[PDB]
From a paper:
The space group of TTERecR16-196 was P21212, and the packing of the molecules in the unit cell was significantly different to full-length TTERecR. Two TTERecR16-196 monomers exist in a back-to-back conformation in the asymmetric unit, and two monomers from different asymmetric units form the TTERecR16-196 dimer by their N-terminal interaction, with an interface area of about 5581 Å2. The most notable difference was that the interface area of the TTERecR N-N dimer had a negative potential, whereas the interface area of the TTERecR16-196 dimer had a positive potential. Superimposing the structures of TTERecR and TTERecR16-196, we found that helix α2 of TTERecR16-196 was 16° deviated to the helix α2 of TTERecR relatively, and helix α3 of TTERecR16-196 correspondingly moved 3 Å, and the zinc finger motif moved 5 Å towards the HhH motif. The helix α1 is essential for formation of the TTERecR N-N dimer and the TTERecOR complex, although helix α1 is located far away from the other three functional domains.
[name] is the most conserved protein in the RecFOR pathway; [name] binds to [name], and [name] interacts with SSBs, then the complex facilitates RecA filament formation on [name]-binding protein (SSB)-coated [name]. [name] is a zinc metalloprotein, which consists of a helix-hairpin-helix (HhH) motif, zinc finger motif, Toprim domain and C-terminal hydrophobic region.
Residue numbers in the entry:
A (entry chain A), B (entry chain D): 16 to 196
């Protein structure tokens, strides 16, 4: 079980409630996963190829990057179809409380992506909670010295909800409502 | 497959970052988990032995039973670090809406802990909503006859929320202030 402590506990709870046939399916799924899935060379989203079909799609706006904590959040933003840009998946947020610093989440590679002056906007779409907002805060500040417009998906997402389980209606609105700095 | 939206995500993360050899080990583990996993003979919490690791610790105050609806709920009362007693997991609540009665949750078991055996207090930690309250009431009505001091978690997730989703400080406080009867 090469798996983290709090996650093992969750699988245990899940597994005990699930029928035999699904347990088998999970165990097959896990193997399939291990060999089909990859991190994208470019956005670090979960995909099945070296480059995700969003990044490999030269019909998209590569000059606008949407930064999300997780792959699911790519999924949520892709239910608008109003967004034509590309993404960056952080794979976490900055959380002192869990010993996850900026060096442990994909911040350096976002930075490397702004080197070639090719990036025009970076939209920050982490959660409206404290770790979400603070991660946003840091990134804004890290990219300031460079030539890049940085915006923050507006309020429209409630107290502490998830960018990821938010309905296409309110997301669209918050993406349109982007504040600068 | 069988797995919650967030959990699936961290799982996939681990899979992608361990060696194939270990992923194969892991698949076998999942099925093995399903063979081993079980409800505690005493509290009905999720465990791999006949008796859970808390019911089996003799340090713990087996006289005070904290009554909870779900395993994750124990998990949350375990971030207390004041609480020293044992639990009972009901596995849900009396719920007129979903048609679940007293017979369908571990209430009887809770009584043949207080009847057969030596108990000095029951802390009712079901949720604060109608369902949680009715459950609590129903139990307190059934534990009247025996001596036991029966108290109730007071001042919980203002909502609307669940116990399993609350602050350590908040719980610590709600616990410190349990009132009878
Ligand atoms: Zn990509
Ligand atoms: Zn037990």
């Amino acid at each position: 079980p090469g798996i983290g402590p709090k996650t093992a506990q969750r699988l245990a709870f899940f597994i005990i409630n699930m029928p035999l046939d699904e347990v088998r399916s999970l165990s097959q799924a896990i193997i399939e996963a291990k060999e089909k899935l990859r991190y994208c060379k470019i956005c670090f989203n979960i995909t099945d190829k070296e480059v995700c079909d969003i990044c490999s799609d030269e019909n998209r706006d590569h000059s606008t990057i949407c930064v999300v904590s997780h792959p699911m959040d790519v999924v949520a933003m892709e239910k608008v179809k109003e967004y034509k840009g590309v993404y960056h998946v952080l794979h976490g947020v900055i959380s002192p409380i869990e010993g996850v610093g900026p060096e442990d989440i994909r911040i350096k590679e976002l930075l490397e992506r702004v080197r070639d002056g090719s990036v025009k906007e970076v939209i920050l779409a982490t959660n409206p909670d404290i770790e979400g907002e603070a991660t946003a805060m840091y990134i804004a500040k890290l990219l300031k010295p460079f030539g890049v417009k940085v915006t923050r998906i507006a309020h429209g997402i409630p107290v502490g909800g998830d960018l990821e389980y938010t309905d296409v209606v309110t997301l669209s609105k918050a993406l349109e409502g982007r504040r600068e700095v």
